[model samples]
Target: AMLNIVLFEPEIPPNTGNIIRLCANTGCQLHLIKPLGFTWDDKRLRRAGLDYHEFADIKHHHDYQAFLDSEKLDSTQPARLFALTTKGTPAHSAVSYQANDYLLFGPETRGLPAYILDALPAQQKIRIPMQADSRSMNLSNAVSVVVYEAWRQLGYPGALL
Candidate 1:
């Protein structure tokens, strides 16, 4: 059950920090696409104060396209890469999540680039339901919600040592 959380060009440090904590606590691999708005050295991430940063399996890619290309080439499974976007159909909970799936998210400001979404392989877009007219949830919160749902569907495996 190799769970991976992939963020495309994330902008906010605090959200990334909280996500680091989430991955640390839940044992999910974290992947960040580059061109971040703030440096990884930002104090905000440090201030989130997660000791499990040491335990986090995190990777960085130069850009979204690079990550996509590498994933397509090396992924053993089909890599059910679900993009969390406002334009996505089907609530996130509606999908039957697999253990090997990769839950991808866009930046805080913009959800995801239309070109990327259009070009993604088949059956790979999902969204968390929000109130009509609601903008969006915080990046970390949204990730936590979706990740835990997927984790729950996996029977909460490896939750304890």
Candidate 2:
């Protein structure tokens, strides 16, 4: 996989569904944390008409720690994990993305909890650019912006296809 997109306890069905389509189209891996707000059978999840085939790379983890262990994130020279939050420094576009890097996003209503955000090093915290005094963007839209930016930085690896 070119990149990994992790949704930490996603609460919105349509947002996750849209992200699924985004991953399918972009060739990015999708990881969903436990306690999702909606089940797989949710009609809102399929509102985009995504077929079952689009979920080929969707991965489920019991929790954040489970995801970390499964991906060997604690190993030496592990893949970098970037957590997106309002508290992040430097805009998302300011960083360089490498292959196998993980982009972690929090829930729709509540962004990443302070504990998780604090755990990540200063460098790994990223945020999307917003207008002055504005609230955050929609979850899916924020993902799209950051994902496409990273993909773009990677030269759109599979774009020729």
Candidate 3:
């Protein structure tokens, strides 16, 4: 996989379904941090497509800490974690994404909790720009934008025409 995309306690099945398709197409790893808003075998996932689940590489972690452990992030060489938040600075487009980097997003209703954001340094926090008085972007759309940008940076390896 070119990159890892983490969705922290995501809600809404269609949003997640869209992301599953996105990850499947992009060849990015998908990590889901519990508790999720929908069931693993929910019909909405099938709505996304039956074949996508087989194509997309997905991992389910008991919690955020479990995810870190699975990735060996606390070891000698920790992976870079970028949390997407409205409060984040430098914008997502400005950052240089690495092959093994992790892009974390929060639940749709509420963004990553303050405690989660507190754990990450300022530079690790990123945001997608918006016009004045605008709300947040759709969860799947945001993921698509960031993942595509990262893939663009990495030259879109293994992507077939």
Order of the predicted models by lDDT, top scorer first: 2, 3, 1
In candidate 1, stretches whose alpha carbon ends up further than 4 angstroms from where it belongs are 42-45, 52-56, 73-78
- Candidate 2 lDDT over 23-124, as tens digits, reads 989989999999898876635445669887788558899898888888888732235888898889978998899988999999999988877777777778
Q: Highest TM-score among the candidates is held by which one?
A: 2
Model 3 RMSD in angstroms:
2.2
TM per model? 0.86, 0.92, 0.91
Q: What would the TM-score be for candidate 2 when compared with the true structure?
A: 0.92
In terms of lDDT, the best-performing candidate is: 2
Q: How do the residues 14-34 of candidate 3 rate in per-residue lDDT, one tens digit apiece?
A: 788888888887889999999
Whichever of 1 and 2 has more lDDT, that candidate is: 2
Give the higher-lDDT candidate: 2 or 3: 2
Poorest 10 consecutive residues of model 2 by lDDT?
39-48
Q: What are the lDDT scores of the predictions, listed in order?
A: 0.79, 0.86, 0.86
Tens-digit lDDT track of model 1 for 18-109: 88888877878888889887877535455567563533457788987677676673333235778888778868887788876789899999
Q: What root-mean-square deviation over C-alphas does model 2 reach?
A: 2.2
